[PDB]
Amino acid sequence: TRLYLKAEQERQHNYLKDGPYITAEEAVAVYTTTVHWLESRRFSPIPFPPLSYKHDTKLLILALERLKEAYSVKSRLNQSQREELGLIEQAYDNPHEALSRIKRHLLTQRA
Amino acid sequence: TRMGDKAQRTKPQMQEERRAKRRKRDEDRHDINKMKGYTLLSEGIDEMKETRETYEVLLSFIQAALGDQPRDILCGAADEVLAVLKNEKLRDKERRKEIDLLLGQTDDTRYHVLVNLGKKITIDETYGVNVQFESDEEEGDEDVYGEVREECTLSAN
Amino acid sequence: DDTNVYRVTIHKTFEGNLTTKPINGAIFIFNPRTGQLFLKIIHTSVWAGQKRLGQ
Amino acid sequence: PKGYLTDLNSMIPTHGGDINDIKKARLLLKSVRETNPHHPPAWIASARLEEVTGKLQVARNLIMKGTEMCPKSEDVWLEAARLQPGDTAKAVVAQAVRHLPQSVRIYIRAAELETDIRAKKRVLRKALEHVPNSV
Amino acid sequence: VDETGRKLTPKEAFRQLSHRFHGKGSGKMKTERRMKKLDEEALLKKMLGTVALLQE
Amino acid sequence: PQSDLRWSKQTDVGITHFRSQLIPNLYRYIQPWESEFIDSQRVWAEYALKRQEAIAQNRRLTLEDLEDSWDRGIPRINTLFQKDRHTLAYDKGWRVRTDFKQYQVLKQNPFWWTHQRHDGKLWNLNNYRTDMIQALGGVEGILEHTLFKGTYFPTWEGLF
């Protein structure tokens, strides 16, 4: 693990030194190919989820269930895992406030 | 040995119990389903469940002995007959001259037929309430009734 | 007998809202032999704001 | 982002409703109505809670149950009429008059749902036929 | 059966057997507790509504 | 071994001796993929016919029909009766999500390819358990080897 992490840091610093390995011409080529394909398909870009989305509660319930599924109870869960379980229960309890938080983060959070 | 041999497929759990629950729910909700689509403001019959078959046989007898009159006439005659034979206070010898006279004086045979109809016919404060908190509603996560419910583009310039 | 432990009063005000007032209950412990009844009073405040289920 | 955040800070509920207390009250009123089917206040309260929070179809079904389990209840019948959509609210309203003749509030709700002069005239003519001596 | 003639539960029957076998009985406190329990049973078996009615 | 299947039992009459083979294997009880697929196509065509007919009748397909097709169909017929069906109707990409879970949850998942909620339970082993007991020599023959008879319980019906 330690050796792999050292190697990964080497990789990141080499990237920052050697800049993008993909040249501008390659980037524009792939970009133009993608836009041509999407235009051909007649694809409509996904919109930012509206305030009153019909299924937002359904999606939140599915997400919380998926998060809960990752706990095959061994009776010994660490602090962070138990805290996440508490947060999941809180979101289950009050769906709308969690949705407001989620949309706020998706709009502003970048760090 | 093949591979599938000795493999078996189970059977629905509590099939009969779920069927019984469905039957009870349907016989209880029969009134609701009967009166579901009857838009009473747009329905003229709403004003006018095994008592309904008795009402129907009463209506059939009245239709036979009255001559195929509108539904309002039939319902009024049925209400008259049932209510009067129920409010006679078990006074029977007087029923001929009235009911059979109304129906056309068919015969005492139909008199003994129609007595069976009257035989088979049959805003609060409420202060003070009790409550019970229980952890009920435990099931197998399957349908409560064993039923299958069902219900600009991109561009480059 | 603990069916009387939790009882409520529902009094209407015809304009604006309707209120339910949790009233005091009773646990009845009756002895058929000596006829001694220990009726324990369950104050409304015990469960008016408990934030707990039947558990 | 600024406009959407403004819309969100507008949407935020100024009343909300403690979900846990809402569930507690829902259980309390469920027990109420279950124990006493003949309490018009029970059904009215259950429907009021289920319409202020949650969705309206469950309250509507509860109120169809309550109207038939509490016959001769103008308040419950009016709860049903107001909760139901106008078209079937009329059916509820006329079921209420059938159960309770001389129901002036119910007939007024019928007229207000009809919202047409001819139907209002006919309904009021029937009501006068029933009870001519009502000013 | 014990000397007093009461049917003996197997546990204390083996207790007495082991006492007689090893050659040492229970302590004074345990003997006192056992005897007080026996007389408690006797007192209970040999036998407040009126008080509550009068106090009401 | 034939010796292992011998077991005794005593009562007031005296002692009586009895006997009852090879252990079952898993493959005989697992169903082949080819049969699975063909039966799935067939059963689901049958269900589509039944569903059209029931929509014509204006009812919902009850459990009484689709009872001969209980554990059949790659999306099992059982999944058609789950409570969470309507909610599940909005779970998309669940197979890819389950496969990717390996980069989030440390535990290794053997069923990384299916979800009990969507595909149903693709196998069954109650018959295997019963056959294992029978082959091992019946409950009494099995219990012979243990210390149960030393406990002196009258029967093995109320124990835990």
Swiss-Prot record, chain A:
Q: Where in the cell is it found?
A: Nucleus; Nucleus speckle
Q: Give the Phosphoserine positions (modified residues).
A: S80
List the expressing tissues: Widely expressed.
Q: How does it assemble?
A: Part of the U5 snRNP complex. Component of the U4/U6-U5 tri-snRNP complex composed of the U4, U6 and U5 snRNAs and at least PRPF3, PRPF4, PRPF6, PRPF8, PRPF31, SNRNP200, TXNL4A, SNRNP40, DDX23, CD2BP2, PPIH, SNU13, EFTUD2, SART1 and USP39. Component of the U5.U4atac/U6atac snRNP complexes in U12-dependent spliceosomes. Within the minor spliceosome, which acts on U12-type introns, interacts with PPIL2 and RBM48. Core component of U2-type precatalytic, catalytic and postcatalytic spliceosomal complexes. Found in a mRNA splicing-dependent exon junction complex (EJC) with SRRM1.
The UniProt comment on domains reads: The MPN (JAB/Mov34) domain mediates interaction with TSSC4 and SNRNP200. Has structural similarity with deubiquitinating enzymes, but lacks the residues that would bind the catalytic metal ion. Contains a region with structural similarity to reverse transcriptase, presenting the classical thumb, fingers and palm architecture, but lacks enzyme activity, since the essential metal-binding residues are not conserved.
Name of the featured protein: Pre-mRNA-processing-splicing factor 8
UniProtKB/Swiss-Prot annotation, chain B:
Disordered: annotated segments: 1-31
Per UniProt, subcellular location reads as: Nucleus
Q: In which tissues is it expressed?
A: Widely expressed.
Q: Which residues form a coiled coil?
A: 5-35
Q: Which family does it belong to?
A: Belongs to the helicase family. SKI2 subfamily.
Self-association or partners: how does it assemble?
Component of a core complex containing at least PRPF8, SNRNP200, EFTUD2 and SNRNP40. Component of the U5 snRNP and U4/U6-U5 tri-snRNP complexes, building blocks of the spliceosome. Component of the U4/U6-U5 tri-snRNP complex composed of the U4, U6 and U5 snRNAs and at least PRPF3, PRPF4, PRPF6, PRPF8, PRPF31, SNRNP200, TXNL4A, SNRNP40, DDX23, CD2BP2, PPIH, SNU13, EFTUD2, SART1 and USP39. Component of precatalytic, catalytic and postcatalytic spliceosomal complexes. Component of the minor spliceosome, which splices U12-type introns.
Which disorder is it connected to? Retinitis pigmentosa 33: A retinal dystrophy belonging to the group of pigmentary retinopathies. Retinitis pigmentosa is characterized by retinal pigment deposits visible on fundus examination and primary loss of rod photoreceptor cells followed by secondary loss of cone photoreceptors. Patients typically have night vision blindness and loss of midperipheral visual field. As their condition progresses, they lose their far peripheral visual field and eventually central vision as well.
Q: What is the protein name for this chain?
A: U5 small nuclear ribonucleoprotein 200 kDa helicase
Q: Which organism is it from?
A: Homo sapiens (Human)
Q: Which residues of the full protein are shown?
A: 50 to 243 of 2136
Curated annotation (Swiss-Prot), chain C:
Tissue-level expression: Widely expressed.
Localization recorded for this chain is: Nucleus; Nucleus speckle
Source species, domain of life: Eukaryota
Show the coiled coil region(s): none
How does the record comment on the protein's domains? Answer: The MPN (JAB/Mov34) domain mediates interaction with TSSC4 and SNRNP200. Has structural similarity with deubiquitinating enzymes, but lacks the residues that would bind the catalytic metal ion.
- What disease is mentioned for this protein? Retinitis pigmentosa 13: A retinal dystrophy belonging to the group of pigmentary retinopathies. Retinitis pigmentosa is characterized by retinal pigment deposits visible on fundus examination and primary loss of rod photoreceptor cells followed by secondary loss of cone photoreceptors. Patients typically have night vision blindness and loss of midperipheral visual field. As their condition progresses, they lose their far peripheral visual field and eventually central vision as well.
Q: What name does UniProt use for this protein?
A: Pre-mRNA-processing-splicing factor 8
Q: Which organism is it from?
A: Homo sapiens
GN (gene name): PRPF8
From Swiss-Prot, chain E:
Q: How is it modified after translation?
A: Sumoylated with SUMO2.
Query: What is the tissue specificity?
Result: Ubiquitously expressed.
The subcellular location is:
Nucleus
Instruction: Cross-link Glycyl lysine isopeptide (Lys-Gly) (interchain with G-Cter in SUMO2): give the residues.
Output: K11, K37, K46
Family to which the UniProt record says this protein belongs: Belongs to the SNU66/SART1 family.
Q: What is the annotated quaternary arrangement, including any partners?
A: Identified in the spliceosome C complex. Component of the U4/U6-U5 tri-snRNP complex composed of the U4, U6 and U5 snRNAs and at least PRPF3, PRPF4, PRPF6, PRPF8, PRPF31, SNRNP200, TXNL4A, SNRNP40, DDX23, CD2BP2, PPIH, SNU13, EFTUD2, SART1 and USP39. Interacts with UBL5. Interacts with IVNS1ABP (via Kelch repeats).
The record describes the protein's role as: Plays a role in mRNA splicing as a component of the U4/U6-U5 tri-snRNP, one of the building blocks of the spliceosome. May also bind to DNA.
Q: What is this protein called?
A: U4/U6.U5 tri-snRNP-associated protein 1
Q: Which residues of the full protein are shown?
A: 713 to 774 of 800
